Amino acid sequence: KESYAIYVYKVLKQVHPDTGISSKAMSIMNSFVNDVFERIAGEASRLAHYNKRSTITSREIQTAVRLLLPGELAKHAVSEGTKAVTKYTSA
Amino acid sequence: KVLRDNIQGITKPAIRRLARRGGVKRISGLIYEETRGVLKVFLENVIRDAVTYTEHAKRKTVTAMDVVYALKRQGRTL
Amino acid sequence: TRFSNRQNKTVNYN
Amino acid sequence: GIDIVINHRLLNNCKENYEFLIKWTDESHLHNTWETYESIGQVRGLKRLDNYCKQFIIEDQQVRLDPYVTAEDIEIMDMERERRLDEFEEFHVPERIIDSQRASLEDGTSQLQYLVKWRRLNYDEATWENATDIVKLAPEQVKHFQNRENSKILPQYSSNYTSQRPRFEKLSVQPPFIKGGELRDFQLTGINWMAFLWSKGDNGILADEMGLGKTVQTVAFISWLIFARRQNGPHIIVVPLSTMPAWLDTFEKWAPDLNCICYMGNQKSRDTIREYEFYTNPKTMKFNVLLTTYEYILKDRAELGSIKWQFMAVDEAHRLKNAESSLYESLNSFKVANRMLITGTPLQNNIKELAALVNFLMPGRFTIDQEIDFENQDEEQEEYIHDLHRRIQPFILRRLKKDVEKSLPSKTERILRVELSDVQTEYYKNILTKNYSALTAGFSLLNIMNELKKASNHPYLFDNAEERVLQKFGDGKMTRENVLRGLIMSSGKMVLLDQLLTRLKKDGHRVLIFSQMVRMLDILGDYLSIKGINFQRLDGTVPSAQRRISIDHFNSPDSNDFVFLLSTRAGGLGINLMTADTVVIFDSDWNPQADLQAMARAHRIGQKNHVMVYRLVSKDTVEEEVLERARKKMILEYAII
Amino acid sequence: LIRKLPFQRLVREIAQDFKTDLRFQSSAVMALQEASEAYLVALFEDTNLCAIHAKRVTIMPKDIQLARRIRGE
Amino acid sequence: KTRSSRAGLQFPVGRVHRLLRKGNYAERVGAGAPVYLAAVLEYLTAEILELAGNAARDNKKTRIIPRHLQLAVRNDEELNKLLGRVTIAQGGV
DNA sequence: CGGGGGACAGCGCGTACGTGCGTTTAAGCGGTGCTAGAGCTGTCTACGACCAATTGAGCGGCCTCGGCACCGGGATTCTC
DNA sequence: GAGAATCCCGGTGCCGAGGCCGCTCAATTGGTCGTAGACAGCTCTAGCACCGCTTAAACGCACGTACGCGCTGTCCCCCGC
Numbered sequence A: 001k002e003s004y005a006i007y008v009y010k011v012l013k014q015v016h017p018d019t020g021i022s023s024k025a026m027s028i029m030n031s032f033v034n035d036v037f038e039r040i041a042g043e044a045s046r047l048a049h050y051n052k053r054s055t056i057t058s059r060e061i062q063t064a065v066r067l068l069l070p071g072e073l074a075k076h077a078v079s080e081g082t083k084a085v086t087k088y089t090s091a
Numbered sequence B: 001k002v003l004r005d006n007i008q009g010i011t012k013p014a015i016r017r018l019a020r021r022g023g024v025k026r027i028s029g030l031i032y033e034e035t036r037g038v039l040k041v042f043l044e045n046v047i048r049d050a051v052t053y054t055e056h057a058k059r060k061t062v063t064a065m066d067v068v069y070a071l072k073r074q075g076r077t078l
Numbered sequence C: 001t002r003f004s005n006r007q008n009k010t011v012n013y014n
Numbered sequence D: 001g002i003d004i005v006i007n008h009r010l011l012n013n014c015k016e017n018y019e020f021l022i023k024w025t026d027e028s029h030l031h032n033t034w035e036t037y038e039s040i041g042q043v044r045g046l047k048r049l050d051n052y053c054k055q056f057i058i059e060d061q062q063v064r065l066d067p068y069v070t071a072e073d074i075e076i077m078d079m080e081r082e083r084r085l086d087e088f089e090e091f092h093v094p095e096r097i098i099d100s101q102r103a104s105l106e107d108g109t110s111q112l113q114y115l116v117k118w119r120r121l122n123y124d125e126a127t128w129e130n131a132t133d134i135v136k137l138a139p140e141q142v143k144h145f146q147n148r149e150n151s152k153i154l155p156q157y158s159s160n161y162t163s164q165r166p167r168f169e170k171l172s173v174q175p176p177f178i179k180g181g182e183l184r185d186f187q188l189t190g191i192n193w194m195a196f197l198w199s200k201g202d203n204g205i206l207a208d209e210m211g212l213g214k215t216v217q218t219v220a221f222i223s224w225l226i227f228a229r230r231q232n233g234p235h236i237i238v239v240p241l242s243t244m245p246a247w248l249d250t251f252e253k254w255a256p257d258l259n260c261i262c263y264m265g266n267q268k269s270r271d272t273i274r275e276y277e278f279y280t281n282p283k284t285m286k287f288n289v290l291l292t293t294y295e296y297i298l299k300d301r302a303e304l305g306s307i308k309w310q311f312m313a314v315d316e317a318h319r320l321k322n323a324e325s326s327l328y329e330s331l332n333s334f335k336v337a338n339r340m341l342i343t344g345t346p347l348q349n350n351i352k353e354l355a356a357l358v359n360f361l362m363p364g365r366f367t368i369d370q371e372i373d374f375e376n377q378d379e380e381q382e383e384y385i386h387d388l389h390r391r392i393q394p395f396i397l398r399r400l401k402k403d404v405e406k407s408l409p410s411k412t413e414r415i416l417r418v419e420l421s422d423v424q425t426e427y428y429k430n431i432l433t434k435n436y437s438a439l440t441a442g443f444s445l446l447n448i449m450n451e452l453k454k455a456s457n458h459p460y461l462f463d464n465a466e467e468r469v470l471q472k473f474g475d476g477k478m479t480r481e482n483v484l485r486g487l488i489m490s491s492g493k494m495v496l497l498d499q500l501l502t503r504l505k506k507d508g509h510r511v512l513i514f515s516q517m518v519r520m521l522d523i524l525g526d527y528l529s530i531k532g533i534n535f536q537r538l539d540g541t542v543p544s545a546q547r548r549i550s551i552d553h554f555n556s557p558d559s560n561d562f563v564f565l566l567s568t569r570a571g572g573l574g575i576n577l578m579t580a581d582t583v584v585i586f587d588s589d590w591n592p593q594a595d596l597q598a599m600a601r602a603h604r605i606g607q608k609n610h611v612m613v614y615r616l617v618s619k620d621t622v623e624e625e626v627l628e629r630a631r632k633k634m635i636l637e638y639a640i641i
Numbered sequence E: 001l002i003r004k005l006p007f008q009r010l011v012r013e014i015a016q017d018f019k020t021d022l023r024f025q026s027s028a029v030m031a032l033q034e035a036s037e038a039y040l041v042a043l044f045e046d047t048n049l050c051a052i053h054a055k056r057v058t059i060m061p062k063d064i065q066l067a068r069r070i071r072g073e
Numbered sequence F: 001k002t003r004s005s006r007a008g009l010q011f012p013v014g015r016v017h018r019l020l021r022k023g024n025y026a027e028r029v030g031a032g033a034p035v036y037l038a039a040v041l042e043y044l045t046a047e048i049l050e051l052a053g054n055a056a057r058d059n060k061k062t063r064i065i066p067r068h069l070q071l072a073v074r075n076d077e078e079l080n081k082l083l084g085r086v087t088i089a090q091g092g093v
Numbered sequence G: 001c002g003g004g005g006g007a008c009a010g011c012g013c014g015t016a017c018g019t020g021c022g023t024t025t026a027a028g029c030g031g032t033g034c035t036a037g038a039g040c041t042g043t044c045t046a047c048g049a050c051c052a053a054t055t056g057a058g059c060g061g062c063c064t065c066g067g068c069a070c071c072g073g074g075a076t077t078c079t080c
Numbered sequence H: 001g002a003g004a005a006t007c008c009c010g011g012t013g014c015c016g017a018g019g020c021c022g023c024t025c026a027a028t029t030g031g032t033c034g035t036a037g038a039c040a041g042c043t044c045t046a047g048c049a050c051c052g053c054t055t056a057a058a059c060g061c062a063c064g065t066a067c068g069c070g071c072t073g074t075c076c077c078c079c080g081c
Ligand SMILES: Nc1ncnc2c1ncn2[C@@H]1O[C@H](COP(=O)(O)OP(=O)(O)O)[C@@H](O)[C@H]1O
Pocket: D181, D182, D183, D184, D187, D209, D210, D211, D212, D213, D214, D215, D216, D217, D344, D574, D576, D604, D605, D606
């Protein structure tokens, strides 16, 4: 129920609208999405606790993703996050 | 009807097919009994924890989600 | 349209 | 290539001295010849001769060297010999020619070969063989082939009828198309009412009682509509496997001149049938009628669904219980001008099944829905079930022998309440009590009802029970008689039925045994054999030919095998056992109608004498509750009538 | 690749050892098949690497024991 | 406009912002964090889906299927080494 | 730097593994039939959270004594 | 058999461990408030067992060869000083 398949469909149409997806693949994407989410969140939490912080911010996640993620994917994703939050905050 | 399936169910041709998928060229005739043992151990490891998950739910039935929990942590370590 | 930032090896999957 | 020998005649002595009635991989059964090991030499498939050599060795060992083999076991060996050799001789007689072609020979001459199918045998064997033998062995078959080549009963000869339906009304004349016997008023009125229903345009149900003529009636009606209604386009008859030969035999006696086929067998068989039997100039399809089983529909769902069917007919139509059945799906992926559903009882269990049937006849046309449903008593449901009754009544035909033909003698039916053995009491308690140690001594509790029910019929359904019983007897293991006793004592029903069987043995009575449980029918098979009884078994495992010939022999009046043992799921349906006066049921199913069907297997047009029926009921065990629920289901039948 | 009926009967046997009374979703059995196949294939690829390192075409049980020790233990 | 559309993002910032509380990860969460999270989630899935789309397209299939995902995942060493312990159901070797 | 041992390559022989063939066997699929437990909903009571006060223990610092390590000498044990 | 390496025994130094004392903070005790969990009941469905039927897969045997193992000889390198 609390699932991303509609968002998967959005980005699927946004990335390869010529491709359908099996419900199996869609579920795998949902499992994948949940896995990466809990991975980054669990890390950022434990980093915040290590920093004695009761709050999580962009820096914590920006640090955590650079920890989790391969070097290119990291700086690309980091730039995407900073761009996005810049647009969000500038709005 | 004397044989028991748990060993026999995993059988020379299927093992051969797994080996071919694993790219193996040729196999000693001894290998199969090692792999059955290893398989039992591997299976034994996961299912015990699935049982305990099912215990904590106090349910009689075991779901794929319990399997996913046991298989998740155990698979990453192994 | 969801453009990809990384420059990566081209693959044939056929 | 080598093909496996019909017979043998005169270990190194066995290899050198003897001679064998070979067959070859590309030559029909009539090409059998006597050949010898050195004369053939090494040839592809010689391991078959090795297999037959081993067989012949063990035959010599069993027939000649083993001193224990009893005279009746030698007689059973002689039966196996002569019966198989006669069936090989039947393979040596053609049954069908499929087509003719002239072909060049290596001498530069040419010969006219007929594609010949063979008796008891199918289009895997069938092959082009020179007509020179066909014309002398079966000129009747040549005549029939020349008819079947030329009937002009084919899809291209009939239109899309649905736009128009002329009336019909009841008639009182014997069908002139029919060679196979003599309809009475009830069969004819079957024909009449089906024709009237067709003439409203409709699809219908036949539920005059089980064994009352439907097969002959339905072939007579299909003949009438082919001839009368020009229904030359294909008709599909779907049939339970065991009865497919009888349906064929019906045609082969009642309208033998029709061009109709049965569709079965391996992909090769079905392919050769499609291309040679169906296709003309591959398409248009040579046959007027195809018999199939349910699963052979799924085997060619879209392929056969490509035909514009003019008529669907359905034996044991309760095989179609619900819309979601893969069969029900496939049959509604098919399109047809008419549908006719045949079953001597129209519903097994519940209103939803009948709703699915009537939707299959006339989808959505009947306002039958859960919103009014079978509360055990309710004025609203009882009103609506009488409203549905009157709505359907133009669309159902139903009668009993009580109506149809008082000449047919009635059935005695009785329950035989019987006590548990000590073994039974122990095991049943050990299901009521949860004793994992008792399970470990002989192992699942995950269906307690099934465990206790099968125990309640027999504790030997737990394999360690036979050991621990015969060891606590101690002598039980030691001899055939001690085994026989230690077995038969272990269930009170077995003791009672052994007494009754001994009485019938003195009577000379002929009897049918039925059970739900194949392992119990195995234990009983072993009991019969150690008791020296002459009998046949039937269950869903025996393939077509052996089961057919078993039925034929048992229906043969000289059959010394006075007992037939049957499964319910396979054996309880479709078949007539007119040589049997008596029927016994070890255990009723949840569904009563299945029991009525089993009764019908005895109870038939062909039954000469008043039948007797007995149900083995254990005292104070759940089957009484099963029986009451089955009776409630029968109350639903009594409500719809 | 591996046969669901034998496989699940084995699975139920082992479960029966721990609990002695179970029910299973068919999805659970499927997941166990997928896991076991993947694990076994990986171990085969390892043991083949061992066999070729020993310059054999045949894999040997020694190669299984070694691979399982080095990776698994 | 909605926080996602304000960021241009195609994911439920409200859900994940809620989930950051619902998972106890911290008793406080700062407004950019769920936004920044959503941005990287979108980026990550896009990279894999692009490769998987090529895999389906190369296999002449419109349907993306576990095989096509698995082929993509194993072909990028970074994704593969990132996902080295992820196992794909019905994803062949 | 020198010497010895291990590594490598090639050859022969036998056995095991692979392939083919035929027959047997159980899986795969569909249907039968039912019951158990799964899940959901509603209600009530217990348990923890929060706040405040009080008391005792733990933590931190200091001092004293004993244990461990290192060094030297002699005898034992292994190795060529 | 002889020499080199290893072990055991005794003394001394040096520091760390263990104990004591006092203070501060945490833990404990008690009361209040609410919500989460537990308990009970109902309805739905999915899970379990068995039969029917087809067909493919698996098993067993025989035949052939190829691969593995062991032996032998040469050469290089690494180990030891
Ligand atoms: N018109 C008839 N005349 C004589 N015998 C008949 C007739 N119709 C049926 N029978 C007998 O009934 C038997 C067939 O039973 P059948 O009625 O075909 O079963 P069902 O119709 O219930 O499927 C045949 O052996 C045949 O002898």
